[PDB]
Symmetry: C2
Amino acid sequence: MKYIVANWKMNMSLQDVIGWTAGFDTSVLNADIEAIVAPSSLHIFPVAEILKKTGVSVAAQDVSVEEKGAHTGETGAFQIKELCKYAVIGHSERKETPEIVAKKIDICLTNGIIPIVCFVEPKKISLYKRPGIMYAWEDPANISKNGRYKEKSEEEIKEGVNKIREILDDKEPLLYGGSVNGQNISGLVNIEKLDGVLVGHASLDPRHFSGIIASY
Amino acid sequence: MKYIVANWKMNMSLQDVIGWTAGFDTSVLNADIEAIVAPSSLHIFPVAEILKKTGVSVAAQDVSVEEKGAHTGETGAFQIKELCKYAVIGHSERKETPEIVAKKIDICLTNGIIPIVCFVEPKKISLYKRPGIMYAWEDPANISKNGRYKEKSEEEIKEGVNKIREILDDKEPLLYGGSVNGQNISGLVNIEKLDGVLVGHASLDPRHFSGIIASY
């Protein structure tokens, strides 16, 4: 099973989101693919409604630490679960401490969300590691900037995955993120112990994103 | 002209939201009030799609400090504007610094959103005051607790409003929040220097909310 996550961050208008879902070629989906789209919080419902029964899954981009109740401005796990299978947790842009990320992981699991936990390098994994989660290795030094890609080499990613697999030695799902695009996806597809990619900038183009899925 | 804001905080499921609209009697609306509903971020779209066509305005419960761009988990003023007229900013539950609140006011106004600025006591107004905003005095001491109302006395409310109106001396819109409910709305309605209410727990029942609206 391979996972391809679109992290739209805060780049999209409502019209952007509607047009993307129209321009997205669902024929690239197959039984061995799990395509996941992560819209901004107020676009989750229209995305889930449009993509219902396509096979595409929805993710939140973050989850509140708080339980259901009087927390103005907080979007809870119990709400996100109703519309989303996954949640991206601990993205480097949010600069959250490990204690906060661990609380978010815990409330995801308590509510039946599969958290996709971002981490900057292999030695950060053990702070989060627990059953039932997905892992996304994304180095902030390799996140794209203004649409220009800052990718790692195949060799660094291969060595990092091998290194990660010494901790994640039970086939835990592992993704890679950082300037993933059509120019480098083939090299990532070929990494045996890698289970997919977390895609930022390139996922804003639905034809680019479907082409990345098609490379698997 | 009076404003009645429902702050649903993080209390509602999607089914709750749907059930709420089915129980909200919009015949209580009229030219002399504006009802504003502030759902969780992921419910703004379905709430707006159901309620705006009946005359109800929508608010976000928060805005990001960030501009459009690569900000995972952040919901931007530019996105909120496409669905909402208003945004609740600076609610005491978020414990935001005045400098953060000021930035959120600024990005609202730049994006054409009317911010509803919460503040705990009249001395905090000066840090925020600028044209084009709505004010909401809410003392954390009088926020309800798991359904138990902790109202302020009408004398202490009237004294606080008088003090606020020495600073807010040009008919700026002023709301009051803090355990507002059927049992004390009549006294608030009769405070001429007040322009409406910010309602948390009581706004979770549509009939209670519409009964509050109908009190003006």
